[PDB]
Amino acid sequence: APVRSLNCTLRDSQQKSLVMSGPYELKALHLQGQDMEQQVVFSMSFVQGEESNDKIPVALGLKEKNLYLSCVLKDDKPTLQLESVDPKNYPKKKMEKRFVFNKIEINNKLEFESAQFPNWYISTSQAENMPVFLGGTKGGQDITDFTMQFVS
């Protein structure tokens, strides 16, 4: 049948919100009150892939935009990018591997591992207003844990 999707927001474990920062850019910063309208709303699709109780393959598209988070090699490194797709063809159940994240539930938080690049995670910096990126370890100064908020 159709792929199933939910609208949601993400915040990192320091409660930083994610916002659009100009073309194909996402930034993490502390947000509260009126300014929270600026946060990015995701359409999280539940896609084809290897699955276990606490490890669920998803795609992360921007709500009602033909833009998806994806993992590709750039100047020879696993990187996180926003990628344009054909809006007639997405979302779909069989998303290409660069778009797939393993959503992992650990100690009441979520981590998003690249399906393409094992042990690379959606990450934020501790500093304010820095890019969201792919970080090649879930252990150090960089933040790899999130909570999800479900949206109407």
Ligand SMILES: CCCC(=O)Nc1nnn(CC)n1
């Ligand atoms: C998925 C988000 C990718 C992104 O934000 N990349 C990126 N690279 N340089 N910047 C501006 C400082 N931002």
